[PDB]
Amino acid sequence: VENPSLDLEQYAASYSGLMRIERLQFIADHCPTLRVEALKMALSFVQRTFNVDMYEEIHRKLSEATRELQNAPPALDTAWVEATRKKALLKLEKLDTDLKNYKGNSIKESIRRGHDDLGDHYLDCGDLSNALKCYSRARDYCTSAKHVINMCLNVIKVSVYLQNWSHVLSYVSKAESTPEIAEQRGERDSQTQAILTKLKCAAGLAELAARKYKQAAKCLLLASFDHCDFPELLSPSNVAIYGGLCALATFDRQELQRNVISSSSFKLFLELEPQVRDIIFKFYESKYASCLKMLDEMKDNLLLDMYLAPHVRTLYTQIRNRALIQYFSPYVSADMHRMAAAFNTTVAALEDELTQLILEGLISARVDSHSKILYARDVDQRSTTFEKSLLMGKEFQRRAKAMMLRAAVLRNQIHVKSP
C-alpha cells in the first residue's frame, strides 16, 4: 500500500477535530513511508484541544516508527499529560458548577447552552459516550425548532464518531420534518444558513457506511456548493469523490445524464476534482480505456481515505461491469480483441469475465472462443412460450398424481405407527 501522490498538508488542512485525528491515524495505519509525517501532524494536533490517550497511542507508534527508521539503514512528556489531566478535570468542575447554577436558576436557554458547552468540552477531552449524553439531556430544554435542529446536528456529529448511522438517518429525518418541512418555501428567496446541505451530506455518509451507494449518491448530488466549509463531517472535494464514484457505480445512462452531468449544483464539485469529472465524462462518451486508466490511477490514492476505502472493491467492480454492459449494448456481434484493448485486459481474461457476466449479469450473449467474437443472443419468443407451457403441464400432472395418492392415503388413514 504505497502512493506518494497524496498531499498530507492540504488533506490535514481541510478537516478538523477527531475527524482530522482519525483520518491521520487511518493514513498512518494503512499507508507506510508516509506514516512518519502522518504521526508528526497527528501529534501536533493531538496536543491541541487537550487529549491524553491519543497522545500516548501516537507517541508509542512514533517511537516504534523511529525504531523502524533506525532499522532501515520526541520524548514522552508526562508533565504536560498530568497538567492536561489537571486542566481538564478543573475545567470540568467549572462547567459542573455553572451547569448546577443554571439548573438552580431554572432557565431553559441557560441549561440547554450549558449542556451544549459541556458536550463540546467532553468532545475535546476524549469522552465518546458522555458527549452524546449531554445533548441527550439537552433535548428536554427546547422550545423553538431551531434549538432542536442545532441539537440534532450535534447528536449526528457525535454519532458519526460513534458509528451509529441508523441514529444519524433518524435524527436527519427528524430535523427535516420538525421545521414545518424545511420551512415549506425555503425561507423566502433562499437562506443564508444552508442546513439542508449539511443534512444531505450527513445522510449521504450514513447511507454510504450502510453500503447503500445509490441513495448515498442521490443525497450527495443534491447538496449545494454554497455551504463551503464543513470539517466536522466531509470536505467538498471528498463530497465530489464519494458522490461521483457512487453515482457512476449505481446510476444508469439516463440517470447519469439527468442527475450527474446536467446537474449545475454538483458541477462546481466536479470542477474541484477534475479526475472524477473526466472519469464520468469518459464513461458517458464510451471511452472506457482512458476511464479505467484514470480510475486505476485514483485507486491507490482513494485506498487511503477513511470512509471510502472499505467500498473501493465493490464500487470499482460495479463500475467495470456496468461499463462492459454499456460497451456491448449497441452491438450484435463484437470483436473480443478490440474489447480486451478497450478494457485494458487480455482476451482470455476478458473471456472469463464475460462468461461470469453472462452467467449472472445483464449480458445476454454467447462467446465464440475460436474466432474470439462475442455474439449477442436473441431469445426465440414462440419456442420459449411453448417450452415453459409444456413443462408447466408436466409439473401440473406430477402434482396431480401426487395429490391423488395423498387423497388415497388420507382416505384409508395409512400412517406409520409410533410403537
Binding site: L354, S369, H370, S383, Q397
Partner: protein
C-alpha cells in the same frame, strides 16, 4: 465411502459424479458457442481433449447436449435449437398431453360425483 457402501447405494454416487461432469459441460452452452476441446478439458477438469471428445459424443448420443464436433480444428460447436414448434410431432405431443389432462379431469369428475352421492358432513 464406508457409509455409502454400508447403505448399499455405492454406484449411484458415482453416477452423481458423472452427472456433475455432465452438468459442467452443460453449463458451457449458456456462455460459449464455439469452444476448443483443450479449453473444455481445462474448465470441466478432464485432462486431455480426448476425454472431452468422449464426453461430448456420449452427451450428443444420449440427447443431453445439442452440439457438434470439428476434429480438423479441434473445436466443439454448440447449436441449442431442438425445435421451432411447427412439426406435426408437437401436434401429436400436445394431443397426447391434452388426452392425459382430459383423463385426469374425467377421474376428478368421477371422484366428485362419488363424493356428491355420499352423506353430508
Amino acid at each position: 465411502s464406508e457409509t455409502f457402501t454400508r447403505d448399499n447405494n455405492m454406484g449411484l454416487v458415482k453416477q452423481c459424479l458423472s452427472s456433475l461432469y455432465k452438468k459442467n459441460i452443460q453449463r458451457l452452452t449458456k456462455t460459449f458457442l464455439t469452444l476448443s476441446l483443450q479449453d473444455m478439458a481445462s474448465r470441466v477438469q478432464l485432462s486431455g481433449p480426448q476425454e472431452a471428445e468422449k464426453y461430448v459424443l456420449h452427451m450428443i448420443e444420449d440427447g443431453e447436449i445439442f452440439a457438434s464436433i470439428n476434429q480438423k480444428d479441434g473445436m466443439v460447436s454448440f447449436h441449442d435449437n431442438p425445435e421451432k414448434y411447427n412439426n406435426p410431432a408437437m401436434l401429436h405431443n400436445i394431443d397426447q398431453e391434452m388426452l392425459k389432462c382430459i383423463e385426469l379431469d374425467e377421474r376428478l369428475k368421477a371422484m366428485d360425483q362419488e363424493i356428491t352421492v355420499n352423506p353430508q358432513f
